[PDB]
Amino acid sequence: YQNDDVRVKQIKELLPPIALLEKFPATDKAAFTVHEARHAIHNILVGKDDRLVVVIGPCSIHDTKAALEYAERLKEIREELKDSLEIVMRVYFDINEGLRIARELLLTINDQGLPTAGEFLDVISPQYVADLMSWGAIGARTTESQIHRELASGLSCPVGFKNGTDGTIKIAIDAINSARSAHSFLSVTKWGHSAIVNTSGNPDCHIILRGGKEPNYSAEHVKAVREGLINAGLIPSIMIDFSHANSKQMEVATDVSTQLSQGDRSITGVMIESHLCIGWDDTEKVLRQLSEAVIARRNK
Amino acid sequence: YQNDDVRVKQIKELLPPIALLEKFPATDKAAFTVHEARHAIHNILVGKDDRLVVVIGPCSIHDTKAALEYAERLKEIREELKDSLEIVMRVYFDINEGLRIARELLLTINDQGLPTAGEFLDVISPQYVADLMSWGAIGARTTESQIHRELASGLSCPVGFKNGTDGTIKIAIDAINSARSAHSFLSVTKWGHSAIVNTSGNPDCHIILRGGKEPNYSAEHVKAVREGLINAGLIPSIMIDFSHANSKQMEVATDVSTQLSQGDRSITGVMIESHLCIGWDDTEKVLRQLSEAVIARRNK
Amino acid sequence: YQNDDVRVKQIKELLPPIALLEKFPATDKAAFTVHEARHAIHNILVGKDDRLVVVIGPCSIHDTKAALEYAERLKEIREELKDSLEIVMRVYFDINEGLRIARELLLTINDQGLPTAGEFLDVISPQYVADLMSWGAIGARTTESQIHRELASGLSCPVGFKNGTDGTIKIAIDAINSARSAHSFLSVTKWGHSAIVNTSGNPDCHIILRGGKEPNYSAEHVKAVREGLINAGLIPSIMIDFSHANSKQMEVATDVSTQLSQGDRSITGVMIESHLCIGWDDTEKVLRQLSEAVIARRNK
Amino acid sequence: YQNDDVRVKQIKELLPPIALLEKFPATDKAAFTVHEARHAIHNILVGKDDRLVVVIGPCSIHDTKAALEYAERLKEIREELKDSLEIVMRVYFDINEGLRIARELLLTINDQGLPTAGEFLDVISPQYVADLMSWGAIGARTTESQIHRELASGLSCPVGFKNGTDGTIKIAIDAINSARSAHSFLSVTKWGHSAIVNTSGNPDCHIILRGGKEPNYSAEHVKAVREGLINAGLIPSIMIDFSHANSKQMEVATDVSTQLSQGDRSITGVMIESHLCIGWDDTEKVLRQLSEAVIARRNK
């Protein structure tokens, strides 16, 4: 009797992580950009830094030429607005070729002094690119998954838990709470071998408001989230996704810029989808608006 | 700057799956029990067999001897009631030692002609035990998770998607729908190496009703689930968990036995938590009650 | 251009050593037999013990029941003659199946309290069986080989270097000299992965006289070997192979028994080829003769 | 008790070959140089091509800048003398760093259109570099060794067996004979995992005359070698090492150039040891003299 693998069409060796690290090692400059962006984001999350984190990028990378072009531009705005914003580029996507393309893109962008952000959707894919990642998001459909909370608990970067697809806040609050503890999960070593990973716990996790069944970017939605975080004993540190089920992106940015201007220190990050999705012209516009809002927040 | 593994306390090689298969190979009898229990469950799920699937076991295995003792008893009742019930034992839990204990327990129970059922929480631990598994659940917290639906799509056994922790049915309906397609995910080979797994799709998935905010086992909840499956184009095949957030387990069994007696052919399985959690005396009682209900279902 | 593997017909993963150790772990009795036999052989090689080492077995194992039967008999003579002889059974041979058969045979024989001896032809297959090996030979054709001297340098058991196929003594003297230093060589971990092995050096290496252009077992050959070891600064500890190019095995045994009787404390081991190659009756005869020779050696 | 690895100070994972191939892939130009040099060497060995193979290089590479400089010069002489000589550079050597340095050096040299030659001491390190190797030697100490003959049997390039350290010709003749059969040996996959390698047999193996107790390069030694190859049914194709125990290098070159001039078609290759060991000025003199000898061989 064939009981084994009756539903597997094919199972093929993946390059071990070490193969991608050898082919595409972090420069000293990449390694620094990553280290600095992770510290900066930590400082912003806890309120030691009054700047806003801004994860902004394409909906997805289809063409690496276009991404590198976007990165050159965004880099200049990262430099100019570095006193009001900490800008990080969202980079979202033969699987071996896919991994080579991905790591190489990430390395190049970090090596130009632009930190990068991604989506952690599995427990094996971080072993190939997390050394080039300054921030990651766990999806709304994986925020209650124990292995995804356990993964967060052992990641070197800060992490955002999206709320559930129906607006549920509690799963993210529990996710953040869980991710701060030590845990165990199964994945592979750098050498590609099945492994037990024991984590130390990650204090740098926070909620992402991405809509749900009702846009959660309102001041009262933000007020209710903040209070739910405070009750649970967590830092009231909140990132608002302008895209996805919050839509229109320009109207969200106006509404959020308001709250920042009124003096809401609880809103510590935002996410924006931006292409060469709003256009590049509108991307600059919104960034300058949020910048203005942060500076006004310093005062009022 | 040390960017790698800043939150990993320890990472150690796990035994490759091949090490546990070599130490604890399936006997011809184990292999048969597994193959036959998976076919039988398939036939029950589609309505070709009018027997009920019954996944019944401890809340968790704390002590293998107690489990082996429970298995000896349950086996005799599996044999006696086999014309009305297909009884499968729920087996739930140094990680290397843990894996040796688990596989050895599973092998012994299957080798005694008692099929076993598990819970898949990750994409790596199936490689160690799935060949001894006649059925598995995806938990309420992972039913919406892409990687878990992809896993289901490539598992050799039937799979139950629990509804969400708040009673939400839709995620299971979508899960079943997704699990029937071919998919890709990352895990390891039998040899323990990082891998791409390409799946062929699994038609043998069904919902599990486990409660949510309020219990969801009553005839009107079952009626609304059935209609929700039918509208989505799926076989109205429903398993009811008597435990968890449906509680009291004896009252659920009474209520369900009723519906089976009334002639509900759409209820094709149940789950029960039972120790040496209800006692052995009450475990036999409930099994005989469901058996009676199935017999009465034959007649009308 | 296809430059890679043009002359490899096929390359297939071998079971990692850990798979054979998990399937066939050393019993407490195996582990002890091995530990004690290796210490005893050490003591005999250095002159602290006045018994003779006797490596005796089939030309090769073709049939494991015949080997197990041979082992039962040899074991009784090991027990009876243990005051004069340290008897060790020579155990020489789908490669995965071959490895399972080999380890299982070795484990059974050691678990019955009969230590085993092998031949190291390569640097990878020790990882599968060395933990059950109380002694090993490097063959005449590899005694000069750097990789084999390096392997000897890192093995847990005593090792014999056969002289060259033409009678050359110096390669063995240099082999002993080399094997006692620390070295490095490439092979695999228990987990099956390519590896660097750093060795501590093995002082428990000695020459084996097997013949050459003409037999080399007589008192004059032994005298010149002893003097060649002394001049090189090494312990005059000599093992004489009764078989191979020394033939007459019994005539060799008579001649060697003589030298032992006359009081030659430099002859510390012998090799005998013995089947169910001399017969079982002649195997007992020779063992009792050497026993007698050891006893008589005590008295002079 | 503690029977495993009592003489292993440390054992560490080595980069899998795939990590070095991914970091330092063969360019199109490297791959071609290798393909062409291996075919050319084949043609010279069998007598289809009346040029001489010349393996010439440093005693060993300590400094890669000096090697690259040597390679640039040798390359110009490879190009100029290509009608009379097929010139190949001898390239001999944290082992992970060592492997990176080695592969990178070899890749650079082949990518400049200069084929490279090495020395096979083990069965694992070919997986890292053999794809950049146009030719290799088995040394005098391993020519008789079974695993080395088996390795030769599965290598993609031609191979030379040196005669034994005492002048013995027969081991090389037997080595050639054995290397042309299919064999099995243990080593790793490109992925770094323990493996069985099944070979197809390598007809492109030949003797290397490297001395012994007395030099073996004169016409009468060559005559006796040739006749020993002929009687064994083998192509009388002979390579003469000018170095090692043949010394003086310039006197050997004179004597050999003679035999080539007198019309000896059986001498198909030579080895020379050369750094910027004879000097660069003397390296050109012998190459041009051998060139002249080849040209004279063409005529009478």
Ligand SMILES: N[C@@H](Cc1ccccc1)C(=O)O
């Ligand atoms: N390498 C990850 C942690 C990790 C290890 C192993 C598996 C998965 C994730 C990091 O440095 O963030």
Ligand SMILES: N[C@@H](Cc1ccccc1)C(=O)O
């Ligand atoms: N072995 C699983 C399928 C699988 C393969 C590889 C990784 C994970 C899962 C089954 O038979 O159900």
Ligand SMILES: N[C@@H](Cc1ccccc1)C(=O)O
């Ligand atoms: N396992 C061998 C040492 C060894 C390790 C690795 C490769 C080869 C040999 C011994 O214990 O004696």
Ligand SMILES: N[C@@H](Cc1ccccc1)C(=O)O
């Ligand atoms: N890769 C070698 C052959 C080889 C394979 C595996 C192990 C060792 C050697 C060659 O191509 O010539």
